[PDB]
Symmetry: D2
């Protein structure tokens, strides 16, 4: 059970992170939605009730992420779970032939900074807050769950920056789990396929037609169920799980 | 949830398969333990009550597996879930120079037959029984979960036969999920690390990063329940291993 | 350089194993084609000249493989390299809903037996032969190269048996490398994508006439000589071990 | 044969990139060592003679890489091969309890910027130069080889930033190969284990066989075979003596 756990969920105002918060709060946990000020964070935290609050923060900022973790610790006393869902996507070829356009350096850097450096910035700072917890009976002080993508493995045309960012999350999953093993913090990454979030919601239903079964986009509530299972299962650690209806992405 | 689902669990008399049966029956499902006659299948099925029965079957025998599946379908109405836990292990080097000892072909074949051919035998026969179910509201007719091992990825010295058998389970997970997509059967594989079961029959726990101990069979059972419940998990292998990576 | 090495190449009468033998013999190695009697083995070994001989053997037979290895080792004095290319393919769904047909157990067992158990059979029996070699200055006594397939990773509809057998070769590559590390035999597996060989008749027809469009670049079937070049690089590079290499034009296979 | 090809090798002043340049120039190719101004690049380029020049540049700078590729084109006429070996490493835990010390953001960013963004920076700019080449008889215009690491798969304690950077090179190998397929540029990544370069010079004893650090010239051989094999694309190759890294 997740009842009573405190979860900080980056990208919590929409899509996968919002669905996660709704499921964990419906199961008794407390959630802090960490998302940018221009998001619907405050609306969604109101709708989810008194066990969910909004902490405005950009995951690339050390100050702002420290302030949101400080608010979560003040309000709820501790942090037990962090879910990294904050992310952006772009579709830009390395070299776009009809326009003779090279991918810019700044667009690659922006996707790296939000998705990869932003996820490490939350990990590193939440690990220190989870380390102040007393261990449970099984030695555990917290669980950190990251969101990669099947683009880490079958990146499509146009996905170089996105796939590098998500490959980086995959690549650092095991060394962070090994780093935090002495303090009892599990680190697991989910790699979603194609899900019905603002990111995707003809262009869309072609995509969807490619998922072997079920033959549709993923429902965010399915991601949220996998996050609850990862929190609950004490032995799942250092691993990346595809959640994708058996799709393999073509170019 | 899993309430009302009917599961067939090979290797169900012991270890990971027994723990899986205990958990699903505790959650309201029915389980049929498929295991060899020499096992404690009957006593464990009686202990679990009327929603658990024992069907004696060797998974390399299509006659015995098909009889066990028919007993399950007649007793409980249908089959919704199959979990392949039947398996054996050996630790035999390919070649051992000091004793000039070559791994026998028979010892390799035996592990492939039980672990890999036996798992495929169950999959192919249970698929058509699941195909008889009316699809649920999301189109699903059943879920098949296999047991590979981290030895599919970091096989140790002595594990050539076991690793070939478990790498075959890994390798066929995707094409069987693609085969069965049109009738709504999901296929997922769990790759355990080191677990506390009779398969071990004295320094193993210290290698695991965290938790730094052998896995508890009930943690495998919990992951099985999650795979059964999640409609979108398919064609994937999941390591359940405390972040271990095996050295030689 | 492979000049002077003695290679035993199973599946040597055709396709990838034949091209391998042609390249290695053209670079000065000696090659023993191991392939079934009912094949072009003999003719191809004659066409390749005196450094190429045909040893009839089914890789599922312990006695035939041992007799082919013994023939290589007596004739040429030693065995330095083994290449496993013998294999078969079938396209059979686990369950075919339209025909209400279940994959037979014997069709799965036969593909496992040739592709997986036959490769292990060659490996286990050649390992002791290579361990009689004097180790070179780097400690090496031999190299074993196996052929899996991208089907170990992206098995298609109908490829359950094939992908199980090739997944088995991938899964055992590391433990066999670790087993043979103390006597200096490297173990490497190549996973080809789609190659222009007599094996292609397995695909539908309107599906084979279609392959090239799926390969990003080069946008065509692989040429067997490209597999052979990769085999030569694996034999030459001393530090390649316990690894599987995809050789596929960057394809990822769809269902 | 690589005879006549022009290769730009980042990190060319030392270690794996230098051994690659030595091997390729000894097989008749031409090589441009792209490495920082403070490296020994110019002296190593003179020792290899007229077919090897140095282009001082930091791979994280657009301007300096553009200048380096223009120098390569001006000297040798075209670019056929790029090899990304420029890289750095740190050993810093995500959180170190005994010191109560969080890994700094800046140390992680530095490693990501040189290893990952710097490799993409070279890839994107060299792809435009290789697209100026007429295709060979097989449609190819160039070959780009990157250097990841086994730390992309078994990153050790202290390797978070390095493993993130190297996992990003692995993750982007396939989409970049797919992006550049229509212009005939293959993209392949090598993931070395443990090699005897300045980055390292009991680790030797953990390699199954050969039981030693890798010799840079074995990485160089593997680069030459990737350049020569027309069908290797979108793949990552471990070059590691069968090691699997423990924590
Ligand atoms: N939807 C898919 O199909 C899919 C597939 C694979 C992986 N993902 C990953 O799932 C995660 C969740 O995405 P989603 O589909 O829910 O999309 P979404 O756009 O609905 O939600 C992402 C949220 O992240 C927030 N965010 C973006 N940049 C941020 C920043 N710097 N700091 C703080 N918050 C920031 C956004 O404001 C938004 O609320 C992302 O990491 C995405 O890459 C999505
Ligand atoms: N315990 C571990 O550390 C571990 C780690 C990784 C993978 N696994 C895998 O988990 C699965 C379960 O093993 P376990 O640890 O529970 O061991 P176990 O020995 O306790 O249980 C395996 C059961 O399979 C049965 N079985 C063996 N061969 C059979 C056959 N031909 N037909 C029918 N039943 C047969 C045995 O009688 C036994 O009851 C196996 O596939 C095993 O390879 C185990
Ligand atoms: N051609 C492709 O597209 C492709 C793709 C991936 C993997 N492969 C693998 O490449 C290897 C070579 O296949 P190919 O394409 O060269 O096909 P091929 O049919 O041209 O050659 C395979 C050879 O293996 C021999 N062989 C089959 N069973 C044997 C047995 N029991 N004992 C001894 N020899 C036996 C056959 O007689 C044949 O000469 C096979 O392992 C195949 O699975 C091929
Ligand atoms: N040596 C190993 O054991 C090992 C193992 C795996 C991966 N690698 C990777 O191999 C590659 C080569 O490293 P190496 O071992 O040869 O080490 P090295 O230090 O000998 O060579 C790396 C070179 O990259 C250059 N470089 C660093 N930052 C740069 C920048 N911003 N711009 C331009 N040049 C820059 C350095 O000046 C140096 O000449 C790196 O990517 C390294 O991460 C090395």
């Amino acid at each position: 059970s997740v009842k009573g756990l405190v979860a900080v969920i980056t990208g919590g105002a929409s899509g996968l992170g919002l669905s996660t918060a709704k499921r964990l709060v419906g199961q008794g946990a407390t959630a802090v939605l960490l998302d940018v000020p221009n998001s619907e964070g405050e609306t969604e935290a109101k709708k989810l009730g008194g066990n969910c609050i909004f902490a405005p923060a950009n995951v690339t900022s050390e100050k702002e992420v420290q302030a949101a973790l400080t608010l979560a610790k003040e309000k709820f006393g501790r942090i037990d779970v962090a879910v990294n869902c904050a992310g952006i996507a772009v579709a830009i070829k390395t070299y776009h032939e009809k326009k003779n356009q090279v991918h810019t350096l700044e667009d690659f850097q922006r996707v790296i900074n939000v998705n990869l450096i932003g996820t490490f910035n939350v990990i590193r700072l939440v690990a220190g807050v989870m380390g102040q917890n007393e261990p449970d009976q099984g030695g555990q002080r917290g669980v950190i769950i990251n969101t990669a993508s099947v683009a880490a493995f079958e990146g499509q045309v146009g996905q170089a920056a996105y796939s590098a960012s998500k490959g980086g999350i995959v690549g650092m999953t095991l060394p962070i789990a090994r780093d935090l093993a002495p303090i009892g913090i599990r680190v697991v990454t989910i790699a979603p396929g194609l899900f019905a979030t603002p990111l995707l919601t003809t262009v869309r239903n072609f995509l969807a037609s490619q998922v072997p079964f079920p033959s549709r986009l993923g429902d965010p509530a399915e991601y949220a169920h996998l996050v609850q299972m990862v929190i609950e299962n004490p032995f799942l650690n250092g691993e990346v799980i595809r959640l994708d209806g058996a799709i393999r992405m073509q170019p």
